[PDB]
Subunit: 349 residues, 2 copies
């Protein structure tokens, strides 16, 4: 019926029309970490070489560690290693660790093979704990933690069969795994995306950021291989910071805005949108305050400030939508209310 | 933008929302109606075109030529109505589609009496004229390249759609070298990528590095592929690109391959090409430092029709760069005949 590798159909949903064909399709998609023995050996070596724990790149890696925890600890127990892997909650932003899990090239002896084992006995706890995120910087600082250690294999990831085959890197790097990245353009609309970011861009006088949905705040570097228009861009003209996995792209820009370093990156989940916060208004006045830490539309008392301003940004105003409320861009300050009364972002990319 | 897709290779099916770049290669000549401005405005633009020295048109794409062809009758009729002894003659597409240094002017004073819509029929065709406004078709002799308009039209905001085959266009306000970004679709997922439009289908992949996998060109246009619709547009010299920048090649690392540089002298006279990394049938290429130097792309067959069996290259890589056209299989510039004297071979007599 067809001699191609991929076939897809777009739906026009009222016409009853339906266009099929072949090509490349980027959907809004917003675990086998090596052989068990090899991973276990990597963790043993990790402790034995100073690395106390892990800072996950994404909300994937964390979930994986969580789903591997039992078998990993059991195998560590089998081969005489008093060490317990503890997997905690994801903390935003997902900070960059200087370490990475070493390839042992000498996998632990008496584990088995596959990753889907059950009905076994859980291992015992230990004073020695291999930490994985979850509010534990006090007992294990960032700078002794592995980060971005895993790479998806060649055909390791797919959406139709939800297996994800991973390996421990041979090299250290800052690049986000390009296996799960999908970027596309069509006429005056475009998108950069992965499993966490959904970043839309449009064409209105200039190419620019339309809106973005972040489900995580990672700090890896979005590869240019999977980025559009990567030349002639001052890093400070971006919206989503480079150090926040923002694509080095002209698509990642907006007239009258600079890099949102001090955005509300402590949030679980943000929706960067160009719309006034509910009940608020914004004026473009050169008498407004200078750009500073992103402020929330509501005070700690939940009091909603009405009038805001910006020195020379453009409308509609940049804003972040989190569960705790609505934040404004760095350029946008309260017009009348003194900044000292408002909730500010205590974080920096 | 809602859809479903199946990947046989990894055996999987998926639905959802997102962005979908299809192989829409060949501006499906059987089916689009074109609306190049209002009839009167276009007519005025052509009148002014002659009256300002521009004798004719060099089309950017096969689509523009087809459009002109489908507009011809009504255009000439309207020119006739308003007392303008001028006949638009549309000829065949010639490759490469050469870049004309000029473009149709916006009159901002549309011709007075013509009609308003573009779909009229049952009318009397206009009479011919000594004055001819040429559109491609072997006419450089009676009108040289450098007196022709080129890349004059822009697709409107929501002017192009694949679902309703209407195409709404306007005459440009400014001259430019950029390919119309309206019909351009570019995408990456995992280790596979594509840069495409209604003329090009350029596949790149990820082996050790990113590289050109294979390309399919139903036309040889000479506009400039915009960086806005291109991936990885930094850290590449114009000479790194396999498909020449002046041959609408994307400024991209995706448009590269180890052991090969710009195919300026590729077989760009062809009506159609499949750039493939695979030996020409009945030939073998040897990486030899004793080989000849880069020159015009040679066809794997003599003009008489015989296969040259042995080829070589100074420092290129295998499989060899080749171009598949209806008239045979050409090699990349880096690849030369191992023994046969280049005198009796067929060479590309064209340059991007
Ligand atoms: C986008 O362009 C339209 C004109 O077509 C304009 O009305 C609109 O305000 C622009 N978008 C923004 C956010 O200004
Ligand atoms: C790179 O491509 C060659 C053929 O062009 C293939 O044989 C090889 O396996 C590829 N590299 C890898 C790492 O698979």
């Amino acid at each position: 019926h067809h001699h191609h590798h991929h076939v897809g159909c777009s739906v026009d949903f009222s016409k009853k029309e339906t266009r099929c064909g072949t090509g490349v399709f980027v959907y809004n998609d917003v675990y086998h970490p090596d052989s068990p023995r090899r991973l276990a050996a990597a963790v043993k070596q990790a402790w034995e070489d100073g690395i106390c724990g892990i800072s996950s790149v994404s909300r994937m890696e964390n979930i994986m560690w969580r789903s591997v925890e039992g078998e990993l600890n059991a195998i560590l127990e089998e081969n005489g290693v008093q060490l317990t892997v503890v997997v905690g909650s994801v903390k935003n932003p997902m900070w960059r660790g200087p370490q990475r899990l070493p390839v042992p090239v000498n996998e632990l002896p008496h584990g088995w093979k596959a990753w889907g084992k059950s009905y076994f006995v859980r291992a015992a706890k230990t004073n020695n704990s291999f930490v994985v995120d979850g509010d534990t910087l006090k007992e294990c600082p960032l700078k002794h933690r592995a980060w971005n250690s895993f790479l998806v294999e060649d055909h390791g990831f797919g959406v139709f069969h939800t297996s994800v085959w991973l390996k421990v890197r041979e090299d250290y790097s800052l690049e986000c795994d390009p296996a799960v990245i999908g970027t596309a353009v069509k006429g005056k609309e475009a998108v950069h995306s992965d499993l966490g970011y959904w970043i839309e861009s449009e064409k209105n006088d200039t190419w620019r950021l339309k809106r973005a949905h972040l489900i995580e705040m990672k700090t890896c570097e979005w590869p240019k291989s999977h980025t559009l228009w990567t030349d002639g861009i001052e890093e400070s003209d971006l919206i989503i910071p480079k150090s926040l996995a923002g694509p080095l792209s002209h698509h990642n820009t907006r007239e009258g805005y600079r890099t949102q370093m001090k955005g509300p990156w402590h949030s679980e989940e943000l929706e960067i949108r160009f719309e006034e916060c509910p009940g608020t208004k914004v004026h473009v006045e050169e008498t407004c305050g200078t750009r500073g830490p992103s402020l929330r539309s509501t005070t700690a008392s939940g009091r909603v400030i009405e009038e805001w301003c910006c020195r020379e940004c453009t409308m509609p105003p940049l804003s972040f939508r989190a569960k705790d409320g609505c934040w404004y861009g760095m350029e946008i300050r309260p017009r009348k209310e003194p900044e000292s009364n408002l909730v500010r972002s205590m974080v920096t990319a």
